[PDB]
Write a structure and sequence with these properties.
Chains A, B: Its EC number is 2.6.1.7, 4.4.1.13, 2.6.1.64. 2 copies of one chain form a homodimer. Chain A is of the alpha/beta class and 419 residues long. The first copy, chain A, has 16 helices and 13 strands. Chain A folds into 2 domains: 161 residues, Aspartate Aminotransferase, domain 1, CATH 3.90.1150.10; 258 residues, Aspartate Aminotransferase, domain 2, CATH 3.40.640. The structure holds 1H-indol-3-ylacetic acid (2 copies) and sodium ion (2 copies).
Chain lengths: 419, 419
């Protein structure tokens, strides 16, 4: 073989496929998990300052992070986590939340280890486990009963304690937690986190916690970081994304926070893979966090204003999608909501596609080509054996400009007449 | 073990002790392998434009590269290599030349594979081979004869054809070629490349070619890309660095060029590790290459002016360093020259050090502390078994501001005249 065996079974990527398909048709693109409006002025200005300031910012910075960035990460997140964070020993700056995940898997996961992943899961957790020689083990959130003409809530998708406990074994190396969850929008409760924490402590397992949507919480729901829970700092790696934090996904800056005895291994991966992150975007992100720490909890701060604005976009989309019979599950956080399409599957089962092909994939192609709306089939966030059973949801992104939502409504009005 | 075994023996960075010692003293830092002056105005302005233009440049771009960048990389390097290059199939944008290297090793190198590495080598080739489960196989360039009258030339460090041929086995997966070479500054001749090409073809080996210093060639020496040789495109990966190209090392943008049947595997690694490179730095790099393509081979082009300027810096450093008995080997390319310190070893054989610490490492420490000049011991660019023999060279970087070269001369004045 030319190629390494570690690449077995991970050459296909759904986003590569889906982005190509959407670009081939005239659509309102609610599949894109990023803003189509500008980042806040302070953030764009921060990047402008970084590229017009000290000329030496054009040259390499320190391997484990631009010092002003590690300093503010350690200060701000130390406060949030109720933890003393050493910028040199407990912070690593990475190429996005994505690179941070990769660094964690490559540092800790070895041949034969099991990694527990919670369905629905941000799809990369599976192939990253595989590339590191790990065996993915899946626990599935249980959609709650929906009654009295109500919409479901993401909060009511349950992490069953018996199910979760049954997935832990002597071979479990890590559990991957994503809260707020992409694609579902669930914000894990203290009780749910205590369940995860108790089992990670009992089995001596590391929790890799993907908290990129930390600030995107709605309806009074509170983000809780599992690393802040008793006994968890010493066994947790906490991941964030500047892009998802500051509505600047193209900046691709992320970080991992955690204890030195774990972090030293991620540093080893980092020094042997990218070595440096870009200097100037780090400077921009540091300046942006400084601004938010200064205004923390104040009504003028982005972390207060932006979630409030996006909650209005969420509510708008929830109302609109119902007009054509899609059934939203109300999210408590993230950029996303999912809609149940089971009524469509029942009444329009015979959409064309491959003999094995999940209904949601076929529905999304139908909707793009005939209705001019893009969504993401939720089955890509499920293990293959479960895709045939979770093929009746699709994911929309509501973090969009007013004009995009109006364009969405135009499409929905046309559909509604065609029902 | 908490950590994965792939990290075995790759946690140490032998640079670090020198960076730390340098920071503790009043030094002229000729160890840093990057400019201490600004990038050219057109490059800095390109980045400024990218962060103050289309607001959507703040969001994600395409996974395998920002299209305007892959477009110009394909056209510009297609011309240079005499090769039809498709942006989508044959170009991958990466996190620097370093990320490009990592991506190639992770795609291709597997347990039980051998990788041929040419000494002195850019130090990461060894641990990257190790992390991917490969066995590094080392072949040393051998300096040709030079008398007490004249200086050696990098061109005269020879790759013995029969030595090289004997390194090849049924297990050889890749050969890593770095031209122009860091630390030595050798520019491989057409003859030397034809030899490498012949053995790679005979044994069905992939040539990973690190060409970050492409533009930094001196004394009328020409950069030849091995991928341009007959039959080589189908078995070569060619790596470049925006940072080394535009004197903007903190930008950390690189690329790999190659045939689809190999590139698809690097795409698999990429999509499962970083997914996106940052958008705006890619826009800046595209704009910078457009500028240089327009002015290709013209007197006003950076690719003509800059290496001419740096040749003058090289010449200044070669003369200056001889004042204290250092013996430069004249480089034909790169940012670097090495000096033989054998005369110091003879006169001052006993220097403070650890057990089996190579003389050059002890000498650099002595020089930093006592003379205020930083260099890099060349033994870090050798396999451990060969460090005993190649213990008497140190690396200087001459890509420095005129003020820095003046400051070098002040340190040399003090070395000669004081005490
Ligand atoms: O959920 C999203 O839309 C964001 C997203 C999709 N594929 C990705 C790959 C890398 C980083 C983020 C994403
Ligand atoms: O040779 C140099 O000084 C440049 C250099 C040393 N270590 C490095 C790691 C990544 C990228 C560049 C370098
Ligand atoms: Na255990
Ligand atoms: Na062979």
């Amino acid at each position: 073989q030319l190629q390494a065996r570690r690449l077995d079974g991970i050459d296909y990527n759904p986003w590569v496929e889906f982005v190509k398909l959407a670009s081939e048709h005239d659509v309102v693109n609610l599949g894109q998990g990023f803003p189509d409006f500008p980042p806040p002025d302070f953030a764009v200005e921060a990047f402008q300052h970084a590229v017009s300031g000290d000329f030496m910012l054009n040259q390499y910075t320190k391997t484990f992070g631009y010092p002003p960035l590690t300093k503010i990460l350690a200060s701000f997140f130390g406060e949030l986590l109720g933890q003393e964070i050493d910028p040199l020993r407990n912070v690593l700056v990475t190429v996005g939340g994505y690179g941070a995940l990769f660094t964690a898997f490559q540092a800790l996961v070895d041949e034969g280890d099991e990694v527990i992943i919670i369905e629905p899961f941000f799809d990369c957790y599976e192939p990253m486990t595989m590339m590191a020689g790990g065996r993915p083990v899946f626990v599935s959130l249980k959609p709650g009963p929906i009654q009295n003409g109500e919409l479901g809530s993401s909060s009511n998708w349950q992490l069953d304690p018996m199910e979760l406990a049954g997935k832990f074994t002597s071979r479990t190396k890590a559990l991957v937690l994503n809260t707020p969850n992409n694609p579902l929008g669930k914000v894990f409760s203290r009780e749910e986190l205590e369940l995860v924490a108790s089992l990670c402590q009992q089995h001596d397992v590391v929790c890799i916690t993907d908290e990129v949507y930390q600030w995107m919480v709605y309806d009074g729901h509170q983000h809780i970081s599992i690393a802040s829970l008793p006994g968890m700092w010493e066994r947790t790696l906490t991941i964030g994304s500047a892009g998802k934090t500051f509505s600047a996904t193209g900046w691709k800056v992320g970080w991992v926070l955690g204890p030195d005895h774990i972090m030293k291994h991620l540093r080893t991966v980092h020094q042997n893979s990218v070595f440096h992150c870009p200097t100037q975007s780090q400077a921009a992100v540091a300046e942006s966090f400084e601004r938010e720490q200064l205004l923390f909890r104040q009504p003028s701060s982005y972390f207060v204003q932006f979630p409030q604005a996006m909650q209005r976009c969420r509510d708008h989309m929830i109302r609109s999608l119902q007009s054509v019979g899609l059934k939203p599950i109300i999210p408590q956080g993230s950029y996303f909501l999912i809609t149940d399409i089971s009524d469509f599957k029942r009444k329009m089962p015979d959409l064309p596609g491959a003999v094995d092909e999940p209904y949601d994939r076929r529905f999304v192609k139908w909707m793009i080509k005939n209705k001019g709306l893009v969504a993401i089939p939720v089955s890509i966030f499920y293990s293959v054996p479960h895709q045939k059973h979770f093929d009746h949801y699709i994911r929309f992104c509501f973090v969009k400009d007013e004009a995009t939502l109006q364009a969405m409504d135009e499409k929905l009005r046309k559909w509604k007449v065609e029902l």
